[model samples]
Target chain A: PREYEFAEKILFTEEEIRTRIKEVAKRIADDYKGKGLRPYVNPLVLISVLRGSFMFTADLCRALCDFNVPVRMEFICVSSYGTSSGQVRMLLDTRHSIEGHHVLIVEDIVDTALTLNYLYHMYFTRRPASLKTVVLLDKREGRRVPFSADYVVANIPNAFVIGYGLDYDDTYRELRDIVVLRPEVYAEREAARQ
Target chain B: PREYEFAEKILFTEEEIRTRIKEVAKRIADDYKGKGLRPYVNPLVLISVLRGSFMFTADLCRALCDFNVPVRMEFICVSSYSGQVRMLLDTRHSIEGHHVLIVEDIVDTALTLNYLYHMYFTRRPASLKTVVLLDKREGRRVPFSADYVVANIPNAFVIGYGLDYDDTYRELRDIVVLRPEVYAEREAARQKKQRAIGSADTDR
Candidate 1:
């Protein structure tokens, strides 16, 4: 409901998250559907680029209820916020050898495009037959880099969000809705953390 | 089962795996049972060496059900099957700033043991602890070492006990138990490979 320097008002709701995720899941299925396709795409290896996008990928896969994708999940460990902002580092590598597989990179939100852009090339060089990107929230207007999500659920006002799998510090990922975390709460928590 | 130079056979049945795991869990519990320790020991993390220990860590955790130790799982992707014999290589980096616990399936060659010891200790994992589902008494030939061992498997040609010939048989619900003849076949294959390579090489 509130606004922040980065994001606008709360534009998405729980119903919207569920419905949109269903829509996105279907689109993904439609794009890769065919005979012998499921096995060819076994374990659609959901690589969650963390700090955000963790909840989105989990829910997105859950939304694909009937789909029998083996779903081998991996968390690419990295710190993309705070002091390590903008600079990309390989905190971890792909858990398994993704030599001849299709990878759908999932991130929470894409703003500057710096981080995703960097990861795009890194994953690409590994020689996967195909690579695609998915973002739950996008800030198209804030696009300083030339990259866009192959699949985007919402293009809403960018705000400091905590719930529904996003967090400040290690908090807020457990929230049920994507809401603008109150400044007072943020400040109080930061103070307590110190 | 078959017999190989490093090991003899897969002696543990499903029931045996359960018993040994339970016994080891008790030992780990009794050793660290008291001290009101947090899961991390403030910064404790268990790094599961890929392939074998991944499954063992899950079973071990279940056996030690009560301790509620905070165990963080990290996977180190390494392959020693490079040469005909064995050569250790570190393909991934460690998670910085944490006490380390290493989990492996078997500790025989000890090639990986030395590799991890130098590699993990250098990262300064506040404290470094190790565990293995199977420990080879005979194959203690290599320099690599493990801190905790579940069983000191004797010279038995075993298969299907959480070990496999190739990547194909990993999914066997029970440790498949290796046979002597099959092991001899594997040994011949290894020797043939060694002759072909002439020498061992490590992946950079």
Candidate 2:
């Protein structure tokens, strides 16, 4: 049984995920080789956006473990859908220990970019040593805002996906690979919103 | 101008607060002495329960600095009495590195305490510890549920005792104590459910 009322499908399997992630990690390692990516030469602090991005950040951190990066992780709560995109009145701020240090924002999915861009500006004001954006899946075709990830795993089609750290009403995060979301689930969520 | 919509006074002055705080710190130090409070022995995480306890926790931690008892800090956000006291959200789970210790505000409801007990207990900590600036045992409408408290502050009808009377009086310099009459006024205000009715007129 799918967690979301919608029917979803797999876009990238576990093997695909591992391969792409390894590639991304290698690039990150090379980029930070001598720079030491960490503020004060500590391990990189991966700031995970809450609720949805937890699993993805964890996996990415795991994949990058070989770098001997001094890893610190934190969550930030922010919202754009209701607080902006006709949702509600809560855009939880992102949580992180990111003062006078390098920060790599790790998000689960990137779409619209309105929220992501807002967050970028938010963190930039914090005076991070450096800022980079990484997303597990990119809805590249659906560009509502002008932004691109410094590191991206997949340019996923505009299809419903579950698993591989995506969720529907907070389910499907447990799924190991990205899959298409079923239509029925969408219909149900749409109905519930009304 | 006072931030709240009512009149108030100070019950416990700065001198009174300092006296009680030393006792609380001494107790906490004794409990952890020789035990070395684990996960990382040198610096224990000193969480400052935010919004107002910032000042209290700072003083408490600083008091221990000379003792060579290293401390780290964290903040747990919880709405005080704006809603049911039981519905708490300690905004500290995001921190991954430190051993967890919490410096809490006064325990009037202990709603925050019970919630913390359950929430932090699940994190599987090196050890969980807490301290409160004030413990209103007699004024406590709820049971005492915290590990350490500065003092079960006596009921002298205090209003400015370093506690935010409403949400606004937090900036007051003097430690204002609340009187029974003031509590009655607040109780009356609560019954009126002023927020729900959306009273356009406010006293403060």
Candidate 3:
């Protein structure tokens, strides 16, 4: 099918993701470890926003294993609901509260930053000791809010891309590398689903 | 210093955990895969109860990759509050007509586990079964049993290997029973904190 045919063109290869993640992991470690902050102040809590970012969260957390500090991992599930208002709602929250702990938000992609910004304010109320955000892809073209991830894996133009956990209508997330999706491909798929 | 010294004994080694999980994964695959049942009718939905079960779910799902079938993963977070179960988060996916396998970290009182089982049952799954890392059968109060369990443990206060005291020690790769003094101290500390907070609320 032409749907998959369009996905054959890779926007970012698997090796690119792996290499980029290691560098990002190093940057995180440098800031968190032995930098006037107590190593045992509290275990750094990584809050991975769910569904799309699970894959990235697993790999990123694994990459940070060399830090040898207790890393508490949590996943928060949020969904963009009420389309007209663009309101975000939390479907899931961390079992352990974020109070007084360093938090790092791991996300898959940041386009308009609506969801990310919403999460930032929501988590801010929990009073984390510190908070930072990271993402795999930064589509700056869609920025509607003044939000940027502290770390980003790749930056690409405004094109419909799927793969590496980004999905369209819940498809193509299992694909290994980031790939550009032809507009018509999804248009046809959506029509067929209806 | 004694607290650090007490967490060293290993009841379940990393190798033991890996081997047992692989066995359990094979059992699930064989049960769900084409033994007089519809093959590929729907993807298996693995519902992992969160906080404690994430590590187990990740490992178990990775082990199931050899089964060569689509497996949908979802996480639900729940906690026992005021002697009842409260669901903090629910799976986003609909489970109707899907084979649901609940991956749990351990089953002790099984109060929360039973709560989750009944909650998912209401969603009208094609079928439902549970897999657990540890089963402390002697401690069960809800008259429930897991469909699959990696290990059956005696009724004792155990920590580590994904279980924690005050949300710590989960990162430990091996299972160990908490020292009696350590456990008591932690319990007392938690109670004291709760009392202090209660008094603070009264003062306010």
Q: Can you write out model 2's per-residue Cα lDDT over A12-119, one digit (the tens) per residue?
A: 776788789878977887776776654223556667665456446645664664444444555454544424432322334433347766678888888877677777
lDDT per residue for candidate 1 within B111-165, as digits (tens), equals 6766676777887766777888877767755555566787777654334334445
Give each prediction's root-mean-square deviation over alpha carbons: 10.2, 18.8, 4.8
Supply the DockQ value of model 3: 0.22
Error of 2 at B123 (Å): 20
Candidate 3 regions with alpha-carbon error over 4 angstroms: A1-23, A35-41, A58-65, A83-86, A95-99, A125-127, A136-144, A153-168, A171-194, B1-6, B12-16, B35-41, B82-84, B155-162, B172-181, B197-204
How does residue A143 of candidate 1 score in lDDT?
A: 74
Instruction: Tell me the number of clashing residue pairs for each predicted model.
Output: 30, 46, 0
Candidate 3 chain B: minimum summed lDDT over ten consecutive residues — where? B1-10
Q: What lDDT tens digits, residue by residue, belong to model 3 across residues B84-193?
A: 37778888779888888888889988987788898899989988899999999998777999999999998776665567666665655567777777777667877776
lDDT of each: 0.60, 0.60, 0.74
Most TM-score-accurate candidate: 3
Strongest candidate by DockQ: 3
Candidate 3 residue lDDT tens string, A42-155: 777888887777666656765665344456777788876555333587788787788998888988899888888888878888899899999989998798788888999889
In candidate 2, the second chain superimposes onto the true chain B with a TM-score of 0.69
